[PDB]
Subunit: 391 residues, 4 copies
C-alpha cells in the first residue's frame, strides 16, 4: 500500500543517520553544510513515533544529536549522539516483517546481514580515525586508510602495515580483534547457512534421489532398471518440483486445507465430466481423498485378475486397456477419462489390463472413499451405472 513507501523512507533516513553520525563525530567540520538536508529526517523520526517494544523508538526519537553538535560538547558527552542509531533494530524488525510478503525471506535476511556488517565496519573505521594523532592529511585518504585497516582486522587477514602505536590505540585494536572478528565470523557463518537454505526443496529432491541411486548402484541393478527410475525421478522433479503435497498439506488446519485442496485439484475437478457440474458438496468430500500417482511409460496400471479396489482418474496422459493376454486393444482412454468402476459396481476380479502408452499422471480414489461416496450420494452412481454397463 503506502505504508511500504513510509517504511522504506524510514529505512532511508536511518541508513542516513548510521552513515552520518560517526562521520560528523570524527570531522566536526560537517553538520554545518548538511544541516538543510538534516532536521527534516529528525522530524521524520519524531513523526514516526505516532505513526505506528518501542523502547528503541522513543529513545531514538529524541532530538539528542542536534544539541550535542550545537553546543560542541567534548567526547565523553559527544558519544551520546549515537542514541539515534537504536532505530536500527526497530527498522530491521519492521523491514523483515513487511518485505517478506513478496520476496524470499532468506534473501532478505542475507541482505540485512550484509548491511549490518557494512555499517559496523564503517563505524569501527570512524572510531579508529579519532584515536590517530592530528596530522595534516586529506580526509579522503585518512578515511580510506582507516577503512582498509578495519576490513583487514575484521577479516582476520592482518597484513600488518597499519598497527596501533599509542596504548589507547592498542586497547582499541585488542577490543576490535576480540569482538569484531568474532562477530564477522558468526555473520559469515549465518550468511553461508542462509545461502544453503535458499533452495531447500531442490536439496531435498537431490538428497532423496541420491540415496536411491546409491542403493541401486550398490545392488548391481541392471542399466535398463537404472533408467525408468532416474528418468522417473527427473520427471517428478520437472512436473512437481519435489514438493510432496501430502507432507506440506498436513501442517495447515482442515478449514484452510480444504481451500488449498480445491484450488490445487480444481484442474482435475473441472476436466472430469463426472466431477464437474456435480454438487459442491460431493466435490468437497472428494477433494481430499484424490491421491496422485505417477506411472511410467509402458507400465501396468491395472492387471486383469487382482481383487480390484481403486478407481483412477486420468489427469494428464494416456493409457490403453488390453485383453487378459494383450491381444485385443479395446478402447484407448485419454486425458479426462476414468477407469476402474466395474470391479466395484459389480464385485468381480479385474476385468482387463491397463497399460500406459506414455508418461501419465493419474489420480487414484481409494476403495473406502469410493464405497462411502456411492452410498451417501446416489446421483453420482447413476452416471457410473450407465457407464459401467456400456463398458
Amino acid at each position: 500500500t503506502y505504508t511500504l513507501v513510509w517504511k522504506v523512507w524510514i529505512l532511508a533516513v536511518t541508513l542516513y543517520y548510521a552513515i552520518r553520525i560517526p562521520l560528523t563525530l570524527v570531522f566536526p567540520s560537517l553538520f554545518s553544510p548538511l544541516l538543510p538536508l538534516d532536521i527534516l529526517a529528525s522530524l521524520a523520526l519524531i513523526a514516526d513515533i505516532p505513526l505506528d517494544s518501542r523502547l528503541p523508538d522513543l529513545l531514538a526519537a529524541l532530538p539528542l544529536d542536534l544539541l550535542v553538535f550545537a553546543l560542541h560538547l567534548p567526547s565523553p558527552l559527544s558519544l551520546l549522539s549515537l542514541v539515534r542509531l537504536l532505530k536500527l533494530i526497530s527498522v530491521q524488525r519492521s523491514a523483515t516483517r513487511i518485505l517478506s510478503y513478496r520476496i524470499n525471506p532468506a534473501l532478505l535476511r542475507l541482505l540485512s546481514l550484509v548491511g549490518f556488517i557494512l555499517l559496523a565496519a564503517h563505524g569501527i573505521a570512524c572510531g579508529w580515525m579519532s584515536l590517530q594523532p592530528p596530522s595534516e592529511n586529506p580526509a579522503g585518504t585518512r578515511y580510506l586508510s582507516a577503512f582498509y585497516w578495519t576490513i583487514t582486522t575484521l577479516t582476520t587477514i592482518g597484513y600488518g602495515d597499519i598497527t596501533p602505536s599509542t596504548p589507547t590505540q592498542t586497547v582499541y585494536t585488542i577490543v576490535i580483534e576480540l569482538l569484531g572478528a568474532a562477530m564477522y565470523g558468526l555473520v559469515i557463518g549465518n550468511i553461508a547457512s542462509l545461502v544453503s537454505k535458499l533452495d531447500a526443496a531442490k536439496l531435498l529432491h537431490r538428497e532423496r534421489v541420491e540415496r536411491v541411486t546409491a542403493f541401486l548402484s550398490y545392488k548391481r541393478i541392471s542399466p535398463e532398471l537404472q533408467r525408468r527410475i532416474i528418468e522417473y525421478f527427473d520427471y517428478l522433479w520437472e512436473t512437481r518440483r519435489g514438493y510432496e503435497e501430502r507432507e506440506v498439506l498436513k501442517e495447515l488446519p482442515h478449514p484452510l486445507r480444504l481451500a488449498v485442496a480445491m484450488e490445487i485439484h480444481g484442474d482435475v475437478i473441472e476436466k472430469v465430466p463426472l466431477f464437474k457440474g456435480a454438487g459442491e458438496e460431493f466435490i468437497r468430500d472428494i477433494i481430499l481423498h484424490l491421491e496422485p500417482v505417477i506411472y511410467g511409460p509402458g507400465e501396468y496400471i491395472i492387471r486383469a485378475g487382482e481383487m480390484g479396489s481403486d478407481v483412477y482418474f486420468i489427469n494428464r496422459g494416456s493409457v490403453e486397456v488390453l485383453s487378459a493376454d494383450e491381444k485385443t486393444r479395446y478402447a484407448i482412454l485419454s486425458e479426462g477419462q476414468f477407469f476402474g468402476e466395474m470391479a466395484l459396481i459389480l464385485r468381480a476380479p479385474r476385468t482387463a489390463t491397463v497399460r500406459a502408452r506414455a508418461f501419465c499422471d493419474l489420480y487414484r480414489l481409494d476403495k473406502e472413499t469410493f464405497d462411502r461416496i456411492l452410498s451417501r450420494y446416489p446421483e453420482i452412481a447413476a452416471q457410473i451405472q450407465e457407464l459401467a454397463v456400456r463398458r
Copy 2:
C-alpha cells in the same frame, strides 16, 4: 538459598587465583603486598573440600603455591604453583549445575566459554612475558604488548610487528599457533552455535511457516488465501509461541503429564460451568483428551449435515450458530459456552451450522472420549440432557 552465595564466592576466589598466579609467576615483586588479601582464599579452598570426581578438588585444595613462592624456587618447580587452577573445571561444572535453575542455560554456557578464552589469553600473555629478555620497561606497557601479541596470534590475524627472536620464543610461538588458534576457532564455533540455539522455538516456527509459504507461492495460491493463512500462522505465533503442546507433553511420564495438563488447562476447566464444580475425577479424565483447535474469522466450525462426532468447548472467542441455509441467527455462543451435544445425545446428522464471528480458540473433545465419559459418570450427562432438550 545460601549455597549460591558460597558457590559464587568460590567462583570469585578461583577467578582471583587464575588472574593472580601467572602475574606473580611473571613478576616476583608481587606476593608481598597481595598476601593479606591472599591466605584467606587459600583457607576458603581448604574449607570448601568438607563443605560439599573431586580429584581436582583435593589437588587444588593443597596450599602448594604458598611454599613455592616463599622458598623462591626456580622455574622447573615454580611452574607447580599452577595446580591451584585445576579448581576451574570443578567450579565451572558447579556453576553450570547450580545457576541453570533460573537463567537460560545456553546463555550461561556462552558466558562460560567467553570467560575460559579470556583466562587462557591472559595466561598465554603471561607466559610470553617470561621468555622475553630482561629490559628496563614499565610493567604495564610490557603486559599490554604481551596481551596484544597473544590476541593477535590467537585470532589468526598476525600483523607481524611482535615476532619471536630466540629459538625458545620461536618454539613457544609455534606451540601457540598450533594450539591456541585452533582452540579459539573451536570455541568461536561453539559460541556461534549457542547463539543460534538461544531461540530454537522461534526458529522452528519460522522454518515451518517458511516451508508452508514457499509451497503456497509455488502453487499460485490466490492472495485472498495467502492471507487467512499467513495471519493464522501469525496468530499461532502470538498466542502460543509456536510450542505445540502435544509434542512437548509426550516426553514427560504420565504422573507428571497429569499435573502439567491440569495446570495448563485449568483456565478452560474453571470457566466451563459444566467442567468446574464437577468431581476431581471427571476433570482428571478430561484434562488429557481436550484438544485445542484454532478457527479463523468467518470460518465454519460445524456444518449442518455431517455425521457429527466432536463436541467443542469455547475457551477464548465467539461463534454463531445459523440455520441450514444461513438465514436464522438462532443464538450467539460466547466465551465459556459449548456446542455439539445433540449430535450424540441423540443420533442425528449435524443440526445447524456454526460459524466464527471472530478469531476463536476452541477445545475439541473427541467422539470416543465423549462416549466413554457419558457412560462412566452419568451425573455429567444429566446436565447435558437438560441442555440438549432446551436446545
Copy 3:
C-alpha cells in the same frame, strides 16, 4: 553417446575463454598469435546455440570480444569482452546434468567447486596486474607475483609483502578482502561438507553400530555378548553394506519397486526349487513379502513349542533341525532348502528345534502372506503337501 564429446568440447573451449580473456585484457600483446587457435571456438559458441534459461547462452554466443580487441577500445568498453564468460554457468549446469549418470555426483560437485575457485583466483590476479604502475618487468614474474598476492588475500593468510599503494589499489584490495575471502570460505565449507557426504552409507552404519556399542558398554554387557553383536554388525556391513532395503525401496513407486524387487531377489527365486519354474504371477506376489533375516552361528531360528507362524527359505547358509531335547540330529538343511510348513499345513505347535550350524542368511515369509498364497494358488500347496507329509 556423441553428445558427451560435444559437451566436453564446449567445456574445453569455455575454460579456454575463461583462461584467455583476462590474459589478453592485461597484455594486449596477445590476440595476434593466438588468433588462429581462436575464431574456431567462437564459431563453436555460435554453432552450439542451435545444437541444444538460455539467456547466458545467447549473450555469450555474441562475437563481442573480437570487435573489442580489434578496435583497441579503452578500458571502460574493453571490460565488455568478459561477456563470453557467462557461458560458464550454462556449461556448469550441463556438465552437472550429463556427467552424473556414471560417476558419483558429490565428487563431480567437488571438482566443479575447485575449478570455480581456481578460475576466480586467476581472474582476480589478472585484475590486480592492470592496476599496477607500468614497470619493466618480465610477464611471467609479474603474473607469478600477482597470483601469489591473490592466493594470499583469498586464503586470509596475509603475509603483507605485497600491499596496495595507490588509492585505486587500496579500493581493489578492500573489495577483494570483502568478497573473495568470504566466497572462498563458503566454497571451502561446501567442499568439506561434500567430502563428508562421499560415504553417507558407511557413516550411517558407523553411527548405528556406535550407538549400540555405547549402550552395551554402559549396561555392563558381558564380553561373550559384546562379541556375537559386534561380529553380527561387522557381517551386516560386509554382506549388505549397511543399506537396509526396506528403507530405500519405500521411496520408489510400486511399478518400479516390483522390477527392483525381482532383480534383487532373483537369486533366491531361482534357487528355491519351489519358487523357480512356478508361474510368473506367484513370484510377483512373493517378491515383495520375502523378508531377509540374519541369524548368528549356533543360534535358534525356531524352537519346538511356540505357535509357529513364519516359513523360512534358506538363501546362503546351513541350519540344523534337532529334537525337542537336542538329542536326535534329524536332517541337515542347506542352501536352497526351506523349513516351517508343518506348523501351518497342519495347525500344531512347532514340531522341532532349528539351530544354525554356521552364519546363515534366511528369507522369512510372514504368516499372513503364506495363508493368502496357499489359498489363491493351490498348485503351490500341492508341492508343499507331499513335502509336509514326508517330513
Copy 4:
C-alpha cells in the same frame, strides 16, 4: 592377543619412516648412522605382507628407499623414496579397525587426525628446507625456522617474517597456502565435530530436558511443579544415563535382543520370587514385555476405581497401599514385591490405592501379556492364586 603387539609395532615403524624419509631427503648426511636401526624395519615391512586393497601394502613393501639413498640419485628420482609412506593409509585403517574394540572410537579418530596433521606439517617443513639457498647454518636452527614457517602458513596466521624469495619458493608457498591451509581447516572442523560427538548421550539428555523446561517456564508452571519435574529428569539422568532402552534395543535383531534383555533385566528376574526359579521359557517370554516406569516420591501408582490393566513388579523402591479414602495403611510393599493381580485374577475395579513412600523404579507388565502368560502356563497362575486370595 599378540596381533595387537604386531599392529602397534607396524605403527611404530611407519611413524619412524614418516619422520625419517623427509629428514634424510633434506640432509644426506644421515642414512649413514641410522642404518643399523634401519634395515630391520624394512624387513618388518617385507615380512608384514605375508602376515595378514593391499595395493599400498605391496607398493610400500618394496625396498625402494635403500637403493635411492645408496646410489645418491638426483632429486627427480630421489623423490621416489616417499613410496614408503603409502603404508600410512593401510596402517591408519588397521589401527582404526583393531583398537576400537576397547576405547571410544571418536577419541581414536581424534588422535588419528592430530597425528596426520602433525606428520603433514613436518613433511611440508622438510620440503621448505630444500628450496632454501645453501647457507652455513646449524641444522637444528634451520629446521626450527622451517617448522615455524610451516605452522604459520598452515594456521592462516601469516606473521610475514619468513617469506619466499625465489620464484620456486613463491610457487611452493602458493601451493602450500592453497592446499595445506584448507586441509588444516577441514581437519580442525572434523576435530571440533568429533569433540562434540564424544558425549552424544549426555547432549541428548540435555536437549530433551532443556526443551521441556523451556515449555514449562513459558506456561507459567508453578515452582512446586517445576520441582518434581527437574528432579525427576535429574534422577533419570543419574540412574539410567539418558539411554532409553526401547530406542536402542530396536536396532538389534530378535535373537540378540533376547540375550541383551535377559542380561539387563536379570536383576529383576532373580529378585522377584515369582519370576526366579520358574522355567527358562516363561522368563524368555516375560523378558521383552517388562516395561520400566519411574514414579516420583509421594505419587499415585494405582488409584482405587479405574478398570485396572497392568501389574507392577517393584525393582528398586518402596510403595504403600492405602484405603479408598487413605485412612488404613494396609501393608507396606518393598523391593522385590509385586501388586496388581486381583484386578485381573478377578474382574473388579481397582481394589485400593498405591502411593510411593519414596523414589521407586517399577516394572510394568501390560494387560495383554498378563492374559497370554496366565493362559499358556498355568503353573505361574497357581502361585498368583494363593497370593490373590490371601490379599
